[PDB]
Each structure stands twice: as C-alpha cells, then as structure tokens.
C-alpha cells in the first residue's frame, strides 16, 4: 500500500521547464514569439476539446474569437458571421450614431448549420458596439441601448482615465443590465482602477497591433504577452475576464494568449480582407487586396488648424476568403494545440497554468529561426 | 459563468512562503529547528486525521512511530507496547542470536483496548529485528526468520557499502518474502545503490542522534531535515518509503519529518526511560533516571589490543512513564499539527508538500528565541 | 529656475538601507530583534506626534495599545484602565457568559484627568470581549450584545477555519452594527478568506507569545515581524486594519510592529503583573510576582479521559506597578521613536513605509550584541 | 476612519514594471529602442501639458528642443526659427570668427504669432554659439561675447580634458555672466570634473549620432539611453541640467530622453533638410534631398601631410519642410506622451522617475518587431 500511501497517487513528475510565474518574473519584455508551451500528456482526441469562453462576467460564448471594432473590420456583416461561428463582433463607431444603431439592429434582427451560433436569452444573435468617452457618446449609447446591444466596449488607447471612469459610472447607473468592457490597459495598476469602477471585462493591449505606431510615437505601451499575463493574473482575483487585443498573427498566437490567462482573443488584421469585412476588393500587381487601417491613422481621424498626431497607419491586406471557411480552421488549430499540451478545455489550460502544471520555455533568436521554415530552396505553405 | 470559466474553480490563492523544493534548494544545512510549516485552511476536526503509514513496500502500520534497535530502547516489552499502540519495534542485536530470536518469539506469541494494534496476516503482532553485515549475521538471520520476524533492518552508520549490498542480495535470494530495510543513508547517491539492490525501505540519518558524536569524530554526516527531504524525494520515484531516524526531540519534530517526505519516524531518546524500555530505574539527586547509550559507545562495543574509535556516548535520561500513556500524546499532537496545516491524512500532507501547496518559512536565531518560552520569571511546562 | 525645474523640488536623497518590501523579500524568517529602522529628518518635537489609530474599519482609538483577552490579563479593571489611557481592553471568555457580560456591563457603566480616554458615541468607555467558535458562543454573544459590547474578537490560534467563517457570517447577519475581529492569522492566504467573510480587522500572530509553545509542539506558525508585514500588506488593499499580537517585549517592538503596517498592538506579558491585572500578588524569594499563563496551558483548559495537548505554559511575571503610570511611558516612547524616524503620526510612518521612503537595516548576531548593553562590570537599567 | 488612517490616503498601487534605477542597474547597454514607459493615470488633457525646460542653471526655455551646432544644421536662419518656436539654436564654428559673430548678430537683431518665442531680458531672441578648446577660440569667444551671445557650448567629442577644463576656467574668469555648456560626456566620472570646473550644463552623448562612426573607429562611447540616465542622475545632485545629444530619430525618442533625466534634447538629422537649414536642396532619383554631414567627416575637416582620422560620414537627408510646421508636431507629440504616462509637465515626469513612481519595461527583439508596423502587404505612414 506504499505505492499509494507515500504521496496519494500524485505520482512523481520530473521538473522540466518554467512555470508562467517564473517566465514572467524574469523582467524581460517578452511577447508571443519569445516562448513556447511544453507538451503534456494526451488522453483524448482533439475533437473533444471544449472552447467555451467567458466574454464578460455574464456573457458566455462558444468560441474565444471576437472581431475588433474597426471601420475596416466590423459592421453588421462581420458581426453576423462571427456570431454564427460562435463568437461575437463589436461594431465600430467611426460613423453617425444612427448608422451604428442600424448596424446593431440588422444583427439583432438577423433570421448552413451553426451548432456553435451565439444567441442571447431571446434566441437572437449577440452584438457588441464601441463608444468613446466624450459627451456625445452618451446619446450614441442611448441609441445603441434601444437597438438592443448586448455589450459595449469603451474604445480608447489608454483606458485608465477620469473620462473612462466617469463614463463607466454613468453607464452602470443608467443601464444596470448592460455589460461594459473597459480598456485598453496593459498594467495591473490601470486594471485596478477600472475594476473598482465596475467593468465586466478588460481589453488588454497597447501598441501591439499590426497597424499601430503608438510605441514609436508616444514611447508608451507594453509587450503583449507580458501585458496579457500580468493583467489576467490581477483580474482573475476579482473574477473579471480579459480580452487579448492586438498582435495576433496566427493560431499559435491565439493559443498562447489563452494559455497566458486571456478568456477571449480580439482580432484585427487576421480578419481583415475577409469577404464579410467592409470595403471593396482591389488589385495591385496581380494580388487581391482590401484596405486595413488604424483608428488613429490620419484618414480614420479625418472621417469626422491643429496638429493631429497619428497613432496608426493605413495599409492593405491580402484576401483571405470567407469567415465561414477561415474560423473553422482557427477552431481546429486551437483544439489541436490544447490536445498537444494535454488539456480538455480552455478553462483547464488556464487552471494548469495558474497551478504551475503547465510549463513553458524561452526561445533565443536562433531558436526562433530553427522554429520557422529553414534549409530549403523553395516551399509552399498551405495551412488548411 | 466567468466565475467558473476563468480558472475552473481553482480559486486565487495569494503566494506566501516557500515550497519545500525552494526551502531546500538554498543550500543551507537546515535541520528541524530552522523552519516552520505555514498554516492552511481547516475544514474538519483533529480526531478525523488518519495516520496510516507505510513502513516498507508491503508493511502498513496504523501510526508512523517505530522504536529504534538499541539495547537501551527495544526488547520484547517495548516491541509489544509499540505494536499494541499501532506502531512497531525493532529488536536490537547486541546479544546472542538465540537471545534475539527468543525476544522475537515472545512478541510473535503475545496473546486495555487496542483498536490501532498492529497485526500481521495471522492476527499476530508484527516484529522487526536488526542484523549486521558480517558473516555471522547470516546465521542470526536464519534464527530470526524461524522465529517469524516480519522485517529486518540492516544496522549500520553508513549503509552504502559492498557489505550491505551483498547482504541485501543474500537475503532477497534466500528469503524472498522477507522485507529488508537498508541504511543508514543521508544522500540520494547512497539511496540509489541501495534501491537498486532491492531494499523495501530506507533508514535515513547520520550523526543527528542524541547520543551520536560521529559528526565530530569522523566529520561525516548531514543535517537531518535536509537528509530526510533529499532522500525521500529520491526514494519516492521508486515507491520506497523512508524512516526518519535520529534527532527527534518532540511532536513538532515528528510532524516536520513526516511533512518533509518521511513515511515513518524512528525514536531513540524520546522512548528511553519509559517503563517498557529495558534496564532498571535509578536515582541521582532525587531524579528518576534510566541509562541510554549509543550503539557505538565504548560500553556498547565492549558488550561483544586495538584502538576502538567511539562514535556514541553513554548517558542517562529522565523517567517518562508508560508507553501506553506517552504514545497517545504523540498521536494527538500529530493529529493537531495536521489539522493546523489543513490536511486530513499524512498521505495528504506529503501530497500537498510535493505539489507545492504546503508552504514553509525559515526561522532566524531571534525567531527561534521568539518561538520558545520567553519574557517570564518562572514557568512550568506540562505537555499533557 | 533649473534648481526647481530639473526635479520639482523633490531633492536628491542618497540611497541608503532597504525598503520594507526589500527587507521582507529576502525570505529570511525575520522577527523584531533582527532589524532596525534608519533615522530620518527631524522638523518637530516629540510631543507633537499623533498616535491616533484604527482598531477596526469603524472604531478609532487615541492610542494604538490594546490588552489581550487572557484570564490573567483583562477583566473590567484592566478594560477601564486601558480605555481611560486611550486604548481598549478585550474581556476574556474563560468564565461563564453571565460573568463575562457583567464585566462588560461594569466597563460600559463606569462613571485624574484623561484627555485621551476612549469613548463611544454615547460618551461611554468602549469595551471588547472574546468569544469562541463553538455553538454555545452564540448564546454568549447574545448576552454580550445586550451588555452593550462594542467589538468582539473571535479567539482562536488558527482563524482560517470553516467554524470561524460560519461564526463571522452568523454575527454579520444577526448583529449588523457589531464590529468583528477575526484571527489569529499569519498568512495572506488565511487573511483572504477572513476578509472575504467580512471581518472588520485581523488579529495577527501564531506562536510568538511569551507563554506559547505552539511552534515547538505543532510545528506551525510564523516569525512575528514577517507575519505582521505580510498580512498588513494584504489587508491594506481592502482597508482592513491589523492588530499585531504576541512577542511584544518593549517599546521598540511596539514601534517596529506599527512601522511594519500594524494599526494597533496587542499586549500580554507586558501588561501582566500590573495592578489592574486580575489575580493576587505573591512573593517568591523577595520578588513581587503575579501569575501569567497561556490560554492553551493545561490549567487554563482545566478551568472547564482524553489527551489534552497543551499549547501554552503557566508562569509568573514581575510586578510592574500601575497601568496609569506604565502606559504613559509607552506613549512617550512611541512618540520619541516616531520623531527619530521623522514622522509626525503613525499614519505617516506607515505611508512612508509603503512608499519606500522609510528605510531599514538587518542586524547580525554581533550587531544585536553591540546593540544591547555591553562592556560593563555592572549596571542598572531604569527605563523611566 | 481606517480608510484614511491605515496609510493616509496614499492608496494601494499594484507593483508592475521596473523603476529607472532598476532598469539601468542591470548592466545591459540599453538605448532608446530597448525599453518602453508604462502608462499611468490620466486626469487632464494633452493641451494642458507644460513643456518649460531648463537649458542651463540660469537660462529657461518654453520647449525642450535645441538645434545642434553643425554646419549643415544651424546658422542664423535656423537659430531664429528655433527661438521663435520656443527653443534655441547653437551657431556652428566651422567658419571664421567674424562670420560666426555676424550670424549671432543677425539673431540678436531679428525684429504670424509666436506665444512660445524665447526672449532674453531685453526682449531679444536668445542665441547660442559653439567654440573649440584651442587658443584661437579665445579670440572667437571675444567676438561672440561682443555680438551678445547668451550661451556658449564647448564643442568636443570627449569633454573631460585639461584643454576643456582650462577653457572653462578662462571663460568663468573673463565673462562671469556668460553661461557655459561643457561636453560631450557619457560618464559620471567625466561629469564630476566638468561640474567641479563650473559648467552650467552638460552635453551628453558619444557616438550615438546618425553621422557618427566614433564607436567603430575608436571603440569608445556609450549607449545613449544609459549615458543620459547616468549623467543626469549625477548632475541632478548639483542642480546641473543635461542636454541629450545624438540618436534622436522620432518623438518617442525625445520623450524617452526627457523621462530619463535630460532637461533639453539636441537634434541633428531630425532638423536637417528643413527649409531653414543651410545649404541648397538637390534631387536624386526624384527625391528632394539636402546634405548632412558629421563635423568629424573629412569634408568638414578639410574646411580649415598628416593622417586625418575621420569620425563622421557625409550624406544626404530627405526634405522635411519648414521648422514652423515640423516643431509644432514634435511639441504635440511630447504633450500626448506626457498625458499617456500621467504627467502634467516635464518637471513632473522627472520627479515621478526619480521617486520610482514612473515605471518602465524592457523590449526583446520580437517585442520591437511587434511594436513596429507588421503583418501588412503595404502601408503609408503619415505622421501629421
Ligand atoms: N494601442 C491601442 O490599443 C490603440 C492605440 C491608438 C489608437 N487606438 C484606437 O484609435 C482610436 C483613438 O483612440 P484614443 O486613444 O485617441 O481615444 P480618444 O479618441 O477617446 O482620446 C483622444 C484624446 O482626448 C481625450 N479625451 C477622451 N475623452 C475625453 C473627454 N470626455 N473630455 C476631454 N478629453 C477627452 C483623451 O484622453 C485623449 O487624449 C480608438 O478607436 C482607439 O481604440 C488604439
Ligand atoms: N549515525 C548513525 O546512524 C550511527 C552512527 C554510528 C553508529 N551507529 C550505530 O552503532 C552501531 C555500529 O555500526 P557501524 O556503523 O560501526 O557498522 P558495523 O559495525 O557494521 O561496521 C564496523 C566496521 O566494519 C566494517 N564492516 C562491516 N561489515 C563488514 C564485512 N562483512 N566485512 C568486513 N568489514 C565490514 C564496516 O564497514 C565498518 O568500518 C550500529 O548499531 C549503528 O546503527 C549509528
Ligand atoms: N498562537 C496563538 O495565537 C495561540 C496559540 C494557542 C492558543 N491560543 C489561545 O488559546 C486558546 C485556545 O484556542 P484554540 O486555538 O485551541 O481554538 P479553539 O479552542 O476554538 O479550538 C479547539 C479545537 O476545536 C476545533 N473547533 C473550533 N470550533 C469548532 C466547532 N464549532 N466545531 C467543531 N470543532 C471546533 C478547533 O478547530 C480546534 O481544533 C484561545 O484562547 C487561543 O487564543 C493562541
Ligand atoms: N560623439 C560625438 O559627440 C562627436 C564625435 C566626434 C566628433 N564630434 C564633433 O566633431 C568635431 C571634432 O571634435 P573633436 O572631438 O575632434 O575635438 P577637437 O577638434 O577639439 O580635438 C581634436 C584633437 O585635438 C586635441 N586638442 C583639443 N584642444 C587642444 C588644445 N588646446 N591643445 C592641444 N590639443 C588639443 C583634442 O584633445 C583632440 O585629440 C566637433 O565639432 C565635435 O563636436 C562629435
Ligand atoms: C494603434 N493601435 C490601433 C489603432 N487602431 C486600432 N488599434 C488596435 O489594434 C487592434 C488590432 O490589431 P491587429 O494586430 O491588426 O489584430 C485593435 O483591436 C485595436 O486595439 C491605431 O490607430 N494605432
Ligand atoms: C551515533 N548514532 C547512533 C549510535 N547508536 C545509535 N545511533 C543512532 O541514533 C538513533 C537514535 O537517536 P535519538 O536522537 O536518541 O532518537 C538510532 O536510531 C541510531 O540511528 C551511536 O553510537 N553513534
Ligand atoms: C500560545 N499563544 C497564546 C496562548 N494564550 C494566549 N496566547 C497568545 O499570546 C498573546 C500574548 O503574548 P505575549 O507575548 O505575552 O504578549 C495573546 O494575545 C494570544 O495571542 C497559548 O496558550 N499558547
Ligand atoms: C560623431 N558624432 C558627431 C559628429 N559631428 C557631430 N556629431 C554629433 O552628432 C550629433 C547629431 O546627431 P543626430 O543623431 O544627427 O541628431 C551632434 O549634435 C554631435 O553631438 C561626427 O563627426 N562624428
């Protein structure tokens, strides 16, 4: 009976790799490409992995994927597609309040099989919308609330402000049933103020986005993986989920963001130039392209005698096809990643991470080269 | 559903204190008085604590207490008392083989209520006996095996020898059903050789005993708490329990030895001058005393023209009363200690320790003074 | 204008010594004698130091001193004396509920000048009382509430239990206006559970008391200075004050406990054998003495067939005179200590400590010897 | 009253990121791109940020921007433009003394709206001029003093020399009212000698300039961010401001230099190929360009048989437009950066930095890639 009595089953496991706490205690400003998750023990098949995810304190999704509130990413079409694949879309506010409300209404009234489709308590697709922290945003909010919006995100580069805190309080007084997402934040100190003010989730990231130049221009921000880990670890103490926002370039980045403590992942460029994204396709040197621009680029700010300091750029992204084809690929990828690290659900991934059972490893520059494609004359990379 | 979905229950727990791995990675030669166990969460009562303990790979006891094979500690009387209170005694070999075998026979034929009493498969009290690693010990072993001994301990200060390894192999060939305890060892390197040779448990400790001067004379040994932790951590990988032997002065020391990975605790001085211990009581300045001596003292070695290098001393210990009164006090103490640290069983204490959930703290010299009785003119310390 | 413009006043200050965060990040189990506070800048006189202190979330005292709920320390006489000198006393519960309630009534109805005297909203002296976590303590609590008690302390060695959490909830439901002190705790993990359950203050300390042997017997506890710093730092986040309890031997210890984050300091032995303490004076070899005993000593437990594991001892303490003479000395000492470290109030001491402005230094053993009296043939130590 | 009494307001702030002292204690030779400033708490608008800056002990500017004394950067036109936008220009000395004095006189006699325009006590634009440390520089200094120059910079790659110290003493004897800037220095040891000799400011930087090859040729220099932090921290003790000189490529670099302790920032390439810069525009492959060269390049040294060891290169820089359009953009950028990090003035930025309230983070190579523009097919970067 010694085989059981020494340690209560709870067998010996050789200690290899670093816990997340150790990896991010080193003070290096790590981001996603700087580390790997070590593989675990596999006892099940990839199709059994559950991706149920908390968007806010009270809104639950079938998948962890959400589309960013950007005028080249999310309108009613994108919101409908993401809700049907089991996520959610946030409708941008670079438009008039009535226009934005009409987009919300199209999503709320919408209606080749969608077992994961997100619904509210009335069998309607959920829809989010963005607002600012200026005075006219109160009227915009009233119209959105009337359209039946399910959650609003307070859209700012630096959410730890008197303006955002006042707006949060105004909302939680006038609309007690509305869920509010605050941000963007990258530190626990910012997160504390926003959680004290009553947000139901946090949007995490500053300057990591593909179109962002805030770190270069204003010298302020944080490496994204560290930002996600630190804010998630703080917000977990109060039961507040975090949306990891910016710098997602592939399925591995999604999996890493979730393993570091995020509950949902927001995507910009990775959903741009899909069919459901707004704007028209164009051609340049034989490649199909669609515009994709920062909300702080001059063109986006000139969308309605003083210096305007641009914080984003305006570019183009290559065609990706349909959301209905692309999102299943991401889902299958995340499921395979969970299987490799030995977890039956995203909830269990994060539980293993906080308990120290999940292990990580740094990657030097040579290790990143080794990790990519190398030593070939030519190749084709087809993902699915 | 976020309250569950973020981390799967598995709530936030502030990080305070050191894991055992961290405490013993510091390289300080710590022993028992140098550290404390931090308190945990209490959900049950002390009388519900289960003290079931593995003595060997195949022998299980109701309590973790065993009496040392010393000619001032354990003969048939002590062995019977410890078996009745739920532990075991090891009969010493500073005597003729027929004498030792007769002691074993008295224990095996023995027979105010003993629900914890240790039994074998034939409703008989279990009994251990010590042997050396010289040639005549083979004949001594034959007699002990005929008397029906349940386990033998190979009695040496430094068990990692060709002599002990040969004796272990001889025993495991001639008596395949006999359990063998090897030792004493204080390092993983020694433990590896003995476990490879096929021992069913390890006796841990060198120079920590109350009567021992081996560290002073031969400069060889180890601080006991470190020795127990290191050897237990190695032996756990192969399912081999360890007996922590030497330097136990009180119930806190017992609890610490068990929390560091030991399965059973051996006691010398703490059981000397009990009524069941051999030898007669005497008086010296109005105090009742009984002799207690090291097996490597000159008097013990003169018990059967060359230098004899003594490794122990010969002294006297104050009267303690009956084993039947004293052992219940130790049991109640260990149960209260487990309750304070939040464990329902010794198995769960060790599981918590290896998983990092159990936390520890060092104690400076001022901290040890603060921990003891201080700032009083006089006092009486009555333990139970 | 550079003299101002470079750093906004905020002059250069050479970096010397360790912040508290650094001192307690080292992992050594430090207690009070292991460190010193470095002196600061003096701009005022000692008599201007304000000692206003928070006892609970809603009870404020003129001084930080409280008397322990022990049957050799605090009854109505001690409670009246401590309330008159600007602190508070907690009446012990090693007595019948009616007896305890009568003590509370004597304090509440009491009535050579006391500008610091503690009062409640009705110009009555405040009074605390201790209760246990067993079922009959509910009836004891009802009687105490009727007597008009202002605060109750839940009296346990290990407060992080289902029993204490249930009792706290029962109290906060039946008596919403009663302040409740939970404990004893020594870790942030324990503090989290108790703060979540709704305590208004925390009692900190396990095994540090002069009469305590818990660390020796049960191996569980913590060095007191570390315990105070860690729990205070956690409890500060939720606005919960801590009472530092046990191991206070002099004014320097009081000052250190307050600088480490405690709001009030509890005293046992240091108030025993005062005139107001219960029990009679006796003589032993020409010294005047009074009994002082742990609440977990056998005699205290035999105050009304099973092992009782003692956790305290029973001793005697030398006569100290009157509380009305002794407490002013402690007050003057604390004020001088604050002046030396450059703080106008205890609140400002703790603010400096948390901001890193207050600096500390470790003391080796030789440093502690040098710090005490040395190099003399004889001496008299008269404190005031 | 506990909410105030525990810590005196002075709320809890989660500890995230590194202080500047910690960031530069690591011994890595960091420069600007290696780190970020973490965002703080915003309570005000960007247009309220005050950029008042100390140029010397006694000269104060409305903005922290100064133009470098280089013959492709600063003559009378540039000096007038920078003084009108609230900064200052230093006229180069690669010319005859009478020529340089005539430039100074044009600035001193000069005359939209310029609310920030720098003035002296006589309502005249301030003007600086560079001199060397050779004997003929004494006569050059006499002419400059007669032209009414307000400050002189002693122009050297390595200012910690007997020549520079003698020249400083000569100046402070013959012209007690003239402000003197010494440099360039990169270490506290050099700064000590120059401050002891009586300089009123320090020019910091060696080899970081865009046109500089000193680090490659002579192996001597320092990474610029470390140089600025170290020298600023030393010079602050004596009330001496530092000008951060070299390697400024964008607004984020300016903000970082100021947050590390610099009072003003000097710019070379970033002001070259402006309209006010001397030299003519030319075309090369359809791009408008203007020459920009190091003062230690062969062409600059051949401006008046022996090896000349070049320390700079000679190149061309793309057209930037007018100083009057470009400088407002930098000003607005610096103000937004201060707002993001939560400071109402540059003085407050540095106060937060020295007090440990301002926090920083390192950036790995992957973090720098993530910080830039990525994951796009094409883009346009328009800054304002
Ligand atoms: N790193 C990022 O995540 C990031 C970075 C840059 C821009 N963006 C995006 O670009 C867009 C612009 O964001 P932004 O940060 O400029 O936010 P914003 O437009 O709300 O802020 C503009 C400026 O006005 C101030 N302001 C805000 N509310 C105010 C009020 N009520 N009264 C007075 N002043 C007020 C802000 O503090 C800020 O200085 C947003 O959509 C944002 O999401 C994101
Ligand atoms: N620290 C401790 O735990 C400790 C220390 C000293 C003594 N003791 C006790 O004192 C007693 C003395 O034991 P010991 O350690 O002296 O061991 P031991 O009496 O078996 O050995 C005595 C010496 O003889 C050698 N030897 C052993 N077997 C041999 C063989 N077959 N052929 C040739 N040489 C052989 C040993 O290696 C050793 O040098 C034991 O009861 C022991 O438990 C214990
Ligand atoms: N280090 C210290 O601070 C310290 C140490 C020892 C004793 N003491 C003092 O001595 C006295 C003894 O306190 P104690 O710690 O023994 O606590 P206690 O007397 O309340 O508990 C005795 C035992 O009964 C259990 N128990 C408590 N409430 C229960 C309930 N409702 N149902 C079932 N079981 C319950 C406890 O968990 C504990 O094991 C107290 O006055 C205490 O303050 C203090
Ligand atoms: N890293 C930089 O900041 C940097 C680097 C290289 C060049 N520069 C610039 O290029 C130009 C060249 O400057 P430099 O550093 O060559 O200094 P410099 O021209 O004054 O010195 C040239 C050499 O002559 C020596 N010298 C100087 N004064 C002397 C005296 N009175 N008597 C005898 N010898 C003397 C110097 O020590 C040096 O070895 C300057 O405008 C400088 O600002 C700057
Ligand atoms: C910086 N960041 C900006 C800007 N507009 C939006 N954003 C942020 O980027 C995210 C998208 O990043 P991708 O990497 O493309 O997925 C958005 O969600 C938002 O947080 C901007 O102008 N400057
Ligand atoms: C050193 N150690 C010795 C000797 N004889 C026995 N022992 C060891 O001491 C243990 C008992 O220690 P206590 O602290 O009294 O409980 C024994 O079990 C054995 O391991 C000796 O001569 N020298
Ligand atoms: C251990 N600790 C005990 C016991 N009774 C009370 N206490 C604790 O000691 C404190 C007093 O300590 P001093 O150092 O004398 O001031 C009490 O307040 C309580 O916390 C006991 O039996 N065992
Ligand atoms: C090295 N450094 C040189 C030389 N001439 C001037 N300088 C330095 O460079 C600064 C300008 O740097 P940018 O990065 O263009 O702004 C000047 O202010 C001066 O310190 C040289 O020949 N070699």
Author numbering:
A (entry chain E), B (entry chain D), C (entry chain A), D (entry chain H): 1 to 111, 231 to 423, 435 to 514
Copy the relevant paper text:
Inosine 5′ monophosphate dehydrogenase (IMPDH) is a critical regulatory enzyme in purine nucleotide biosynthesis that is inhibited by the downstream product GTP. IMPDH catalyzes the rate-limiting step of de novo guanine nucleotide biosynthesis—the conversion of inosine 5′-monophosphate (IMP) to xanthosine 5′-monophosphate. The IMPDH protomer consists of a catalytic domain and a regulatory Bateman domain, connected by a flexible hinge. IMPDH constitutively assembles tetramers through catalytic domain interactions, and tetramers reversibly dimerize into octamers through interactions of the Bateman domains in response to binding of ATP or GTP in three allosteric sites.
First, we determined the structure of L245P in the catalytically active extended conformation in the absence of GTP. The approach also allows us to generate focused reconstructions of the repeating octameric subunit and the filament assembly interface. Following symmetry expansion and focused classification, we found that the majority of L245P segments were sorted into fully extended classes (73%) compared to only 17% fully extended WT IMPDH2 segments under these conditions. The extended L245P structures refined to global resolutions that were significantly higher than our earlier WT structures—2.0 Å for the filament assembly interface and the catalytic core and 2.6 Å resolution for the octamer-centered reconstruction. Overall, the structures are nearly identical to the WT structure under this condition at the level of individual protomers, octamers, and the filament assembly interface.
